[PDB]
Symmetry: C4
Amino acid sequence: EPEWTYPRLSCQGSTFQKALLISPHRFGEIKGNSAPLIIREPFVACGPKECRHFALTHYAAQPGGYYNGTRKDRNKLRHLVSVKLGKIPTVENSIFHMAAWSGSACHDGREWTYIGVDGPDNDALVKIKYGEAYTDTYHSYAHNILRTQESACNCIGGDCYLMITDGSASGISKCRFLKIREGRIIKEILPTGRVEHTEECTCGFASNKTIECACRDNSYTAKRPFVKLNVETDTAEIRLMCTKTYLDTPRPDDGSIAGPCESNGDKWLGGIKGGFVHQRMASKIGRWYSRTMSKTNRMGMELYVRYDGDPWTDSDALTLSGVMVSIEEPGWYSFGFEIKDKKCDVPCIGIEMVHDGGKDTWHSAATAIYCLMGSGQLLWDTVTGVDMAL
Amino acid sequence: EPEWTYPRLSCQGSTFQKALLISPHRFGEIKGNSAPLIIREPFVACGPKECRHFALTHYAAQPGGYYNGTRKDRNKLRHLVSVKLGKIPTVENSIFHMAAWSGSACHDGREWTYIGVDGPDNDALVKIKYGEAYTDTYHSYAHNILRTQESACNCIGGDCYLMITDGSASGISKCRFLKIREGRIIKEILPTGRVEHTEECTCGFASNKTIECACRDNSYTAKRPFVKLNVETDTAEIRLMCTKTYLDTPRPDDGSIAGPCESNGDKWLGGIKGGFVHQRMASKIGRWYSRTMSKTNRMGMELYVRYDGDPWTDSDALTLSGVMVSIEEPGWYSFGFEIKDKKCDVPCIGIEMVHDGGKDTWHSAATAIYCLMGSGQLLWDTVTGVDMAL
Amino acid sequence: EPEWTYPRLSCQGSTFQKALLISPHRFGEIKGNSAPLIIREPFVACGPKECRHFALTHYAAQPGGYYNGTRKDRNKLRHLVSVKLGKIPTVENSIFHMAAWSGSACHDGREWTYIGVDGPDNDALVKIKYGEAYTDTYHSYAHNILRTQESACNCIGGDCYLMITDGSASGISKCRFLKIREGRIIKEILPTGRVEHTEECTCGFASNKTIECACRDNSYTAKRPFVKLNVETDTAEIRLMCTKTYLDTPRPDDGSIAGPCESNGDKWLGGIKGGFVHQRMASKIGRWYSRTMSKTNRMGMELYVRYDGDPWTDSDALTLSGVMVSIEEPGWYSFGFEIKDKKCDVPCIGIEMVHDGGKDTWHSAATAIYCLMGSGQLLWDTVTGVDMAL
Amino acid sequence: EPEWTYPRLSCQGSTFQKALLISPHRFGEIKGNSAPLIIREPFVACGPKECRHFALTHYAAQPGGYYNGTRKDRNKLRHLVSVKLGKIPTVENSIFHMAAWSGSACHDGREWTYIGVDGPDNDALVKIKYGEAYTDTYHSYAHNILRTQESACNCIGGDCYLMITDGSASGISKCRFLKIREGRIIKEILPTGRVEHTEECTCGFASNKTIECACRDNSYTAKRPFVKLNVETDTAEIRLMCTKTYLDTPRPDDGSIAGPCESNGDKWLGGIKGGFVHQRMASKIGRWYSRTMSKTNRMGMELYVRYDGDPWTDSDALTLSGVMVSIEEPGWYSFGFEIKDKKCDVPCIGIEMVHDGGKDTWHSAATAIYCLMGSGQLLWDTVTGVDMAL
Ligand SMILES: CC(=O)Nc1c(O)cc(C(=O)O)cc1[N+](=O)[O-]
Ligand SMILES: CC(=O)Nc1c(O)cc(C(=O)O)cc1[N+](=O)[O-]
Ligand SMILES: CC(=O)Nc1c(O)cc(C(=O)O)cc1[N+](=O)[O-]
Ligand SMILES: CC(=O)Nc1c(O)cc(C(=O)O)cc1[N+](=O)[O-]
Ligand SMILES: *[C@@H]1O[C@H](CO)[C@@H](O)[C@H](O)[C@H]1NC(C)=O
Ligand SMILES: *[C@@H]1O[C@H](CO)[C@@H](O)[C@H](O)[C@H]1NC(C)=O
Ligand SMILES: *[C@@H]1O[C@H](CO)[C@@H](O)[C@H](O)[C@H]1NC(C)=O
Ligand SMILES: *[C@@H]1O[C@H](CO)[C@@H](O)[C@H](O)[C@H]1NC(C)=O
Ligand SMILES: [Ca+2]
Ligand SMILES: [Ca+2]
Ligand SMILES: [Ca+2]
Ligand SMILES: [Ca+2]
Ligand SMILES: [Ca+2]
């Protein structure tokens, strides 16, 4: 039978190139004969033999007449769905896993674990599904919107670690960590370090002994609190990334926050998810970041890198690596994923491109994928090609 | 090759939580591009590697123009269909098994058996299908609408037991039992005890030596006749559940039926299916019941429990365990199902939520699933989110 | 790997009952969101692990605007398609095998062979497909519409035998036989006996040493020429069935054709396909026939039997066994099929029910299946439930 | 596990016959309920157990409202999609592999490699995908629309060879060759001989030691430069086919280009893809060509042959072998493919039939397949049966 997954050295490449685009709404005209689901919070988790495209649907499709409610984040209709990667998320292609308005996913070499969050805002709840079975739950500790990553969780030899959090968006949201094995929580990690507001952690293996996530602070700063989880002692420590190249949105001009690394500067009320992906080489490591082109809005998407060094102390700017999405195209949530080759892991960064015709219409995104391919420079950007009028 | 199924100890949990929702009609607008089938009598039967969502379709989809006939129970168009669980029951996703207007299903570790009932009301007939093969039938003994469970049948080491019945709804409907092995009836069980009217038996393993069903009495009482089948001697004995917490609908105020356990009280003409599921623990057992919130109507759904004791004699009230469906939401048929983990069985209760715009329109339901997850208390209810006007 | 198929003793039963109904057009309203293909000439061929529903589509779906041409039998658009049995023949569910306006199919325990016929009426051609590969062809010998069975072909230990024919409908159509192994014709059988007009042979194993087909004579008689192929010497002999119960349509009153068995009587210009299926028992054999209720038209369907005896000499009437389709319902082509159980073969008879709103509309059928189940008598008929106006 | 593919001797046959037709737009009426994708550049690549129908979709379906842009060759929406052969290329049936506006595909007995080209016209890029993984890229050497075959690539014992090119359509487009193993380029072949303009190479194994492609010269000639790649030394040599029967389009009367084989004659600005397929016999070889009936336009399709001899020197005319598509039907790109039997390879030629209602509408093709079957002569042509008004 199957064996447990561990990260290996990433495949060989020097830059990312444009891989794939799933734009369901290109097939959502009232004059079309198709039915793409209203979803957001998309992500890809790649198991051994396959990758899955997950998302939270509003239990609604376009065209239709259940548009009002779609721009809202949490309700009793949302669900975690998936289609194997490369398939359009239509009503029939999609498998509905469980009810949730927050979520994550990961395949341990042997099976899929699905994490989903639902219930009351004051008493929400985390739910685990191992394959087809409901196996566990984790309660709301801070009684203030229990949430999870919204990206892939990370398994190493049978144990998968998940980030959750709880608290006010404008205040203190302190995240814990969940160690799940066979769809059951075998440990509850309480991080150390700057813990004032950590949410929507994009986590990836920086080797076998450690996992690092670039995350989200909704209040206090435009910097990203950076996690490092030692899988061997089962301890967590978080501290803000020191790079003058700020990754959250909004943010001010770069290098504008004066003072030691550990200084938040101004609050810049809000945040956004950003893709973070390692390129574990033999003698060295590359970390890839992507951020919105706009500093106040969700317009555009550009990706950077900086090999080695320490996320925590390096004041320095990151090396820009090209533009995946132009300022005229949307650039919302971002996450990183990894494809399993025979003898190497391929790093990738997905970019949710939300179709936002505002308040009285439907609300869904597209998904542009970029993955490390060969050398030279990033060559093309992505456009959705969607007309919200059709 | 595959091995025979037996129940094991249920997985560890203390309460049920909201698992999943399949609302096909959320995708049935005339302005939509989808096609969910008009069905009712839904149920889930979980084999080793998978669960299936079954139902009797009126061989019709929404939107369409074959709505007139859908509110009726038996005709020559109805069929037993299935989709793996988590898939929406559309025209193309669904597999049609055989023609039937009554039915059941169960997977013996090796294959699916499908039971379906059709023919004339005066001479209906039970039909068995082992995998893809028609293998057997069982004739109408009381010539008065031969029917079956409408929920999952129960297999233990190669033998599956099914409940059937026959008779007037307003009168005497005495049920027999069918022992099927390899899609062929190897024994005909005639129960003992109070046998005046037993129908729509929700049956589940209360261990290896016994199966218990909470069922339906359409005439004589608002209590539920409770079955106990000893799989070892192949004998059946039925007696009304003594709980002051009445489970059928309609029913009067609880504890209102004065007298020994065995007393029907007033007729309360009618009944409904209710989900019943055991939580077999090592030193003890939990039985889970769900009933309509409304005592005269099919509005709402709440679930209870009471560990151990005897269904037959216990006059006592049951412990309420939360509300799965609110009084403003429908709560029709209910059934229990069990998911197969690696080393444990997960108990579940499905709730059919019928969309009933009455007499001159379409008639189909939704399916809300709740399964045992962790501890604390049931946290959320279900709503269909369907507008019968679209 | 897989082993070669041979017929075994049929499963145990005494009568046929109503098994399944595939009515695609129940989902073909202009107000529906579905797309069932315009097809006719449906048949089912059951391999080891599965049965397939085949048909010749006019490369068109309902609703649409390619209806004109559908009532015609041969054109350059027709194709042999299939869906596993129980699935509705829609545009996406269906697999297109090859181009043909005549056809057959059979699975040898190891793979599917697909036979299809196309080309000019004066120089048509038979084409073999083994799995996904084009392997062979067989030319038009009588240059007058080379055709094939329109039902399942029959394989025994690696060799499959197929009937073809060629000639005028109003005149002499002498059929040959094709022995195919691994998708290649290894022998060309020329039958013996009355060979004036044999077409659309419904063939089934009457044991290991022989295959018998009840067939079609378009000119000369309302009786059915009956084939017997000895698989051991590879010889064929045909002679008209002697039963006073005539099986072709049209036909006159039964027992009206005076004279020895071998007498055609009046021509009764025309014919139709009829399902023929054996029930090979240990000490005996049952042959099942179905014929139209109407003697001049294609209205209704009734099925008969007569165990043992000789198709060739028995003047006697057959035993009626019930009505599968009422005079108010259509009853066109019929064929027999067999389902593979673990230790027995289940006999079946399918009935094509053509939706014929005549000349200026669409033209497609439904498929009612009846299979041997238990004992007693056939209990129900089939209706399509289709309204050609929607 | 699986073993590496090598070509074997082709199956036995003498002529090609009409195999299959995939006309998605037959299901694209505004009154239909289907959704076929706007695609062109279709091709089939057959692995061991299966064949796939690939094409570059304009990320659009018919009916819809994204028609404007479809007649253009390169944009940021195009994608390489596939459906197993015999399935209609609809939105849900189709798998999207990667973004590309040029492409190829091939299965090495063990896995699928997908090649796709995208990026800026001045700096386009070749991209390799082994199974689900992005593994490599190859940059634009002549900075003038890096393109690839548009047909199947060819693998022999683990190594697959691909043709690419780069340059002006009106000028010098010199092609290189790519040797890919496990989805990574292990060698870059630079051909020898007449190398002025070689593009869209249709390549097939002429044995184990060699691969030959009949290709496209957009400027200089109406003859086809003919490649021969020695898989053993990894060298390439190209020279124009000498046949008086010219294969490119446009072309003048045949035998009109006076002079030695190596003479281009007049430019005949333009070209088209043509199917080329070998029939490797034991003592001899057959090469099959197909060309447009029209000499100036893309109307019709006829196929020829000539066994043995040398593509390079033979001035002679080819033997016509029938007409697959009539002058009243379109005949655009053509390619050759091979189906894997148990002990032999079946040669095939696909013909893209473009639906070209010009400038302000949708733009997609159909696919007619012809494969070697038995003997005698090609018997039928193909028509799409599409009405661009519906
Ligand atoms: C818990 C929750 O509602 N999830 C959530 C989203 O679904 C979306 C966004 C967002 O910033 O667009 C934000 C948040 N968020 O609150 O983090
Ligand atoms: C035999 C039959 O018609 N089945 C049936 C149903 O399908 C539904 C109901 C019902 O109470 O809604 C009731 C019954 N019932 O009669 O039990
Ligand atoms: C060869 C051919 O055209 N096949 C055919 C059909 O498809 C249908 C019928 C028929 O009697 O309805 C008849 C015939 N037939 O001619 O046998
Ligand atoms: C590179 C590119 O644009 N590919 C391409 C096509 O997609 C189509 C045609 C063509 O001749 O129709 C031609 C060409 N071509 O330029 O070869
Ligand atoms: C982690 O462990 C596995 C073996 O247990 C090894 O193959 C893998 O490469 C390790 N990770 C890295 C980056 O080396
Ligand atoms: C019933 O039998 C099987 C072994 O035959 C055992 O594993 C199972 O646990 C038993 N049921 C229970 C509740 O113990
Ligand atoms: C025909 O042959 C196989 C063994 O080769 C046997 O099992 C089968 O039963 C035979 N057919 C019948 C009716 O006995
Ligand atoms: C090429 O090699 C394989 C064995 O490696 C052989 O079977 C195949 O036939 C060869 N090709 C031809 C045409 O012989
Ligand atoms: Ca569909
Ligand atoms: Ca912030
Ligand atoms: Ca009652
Ligand atoms: Ca006749
Ligand atoms: Ca040219």
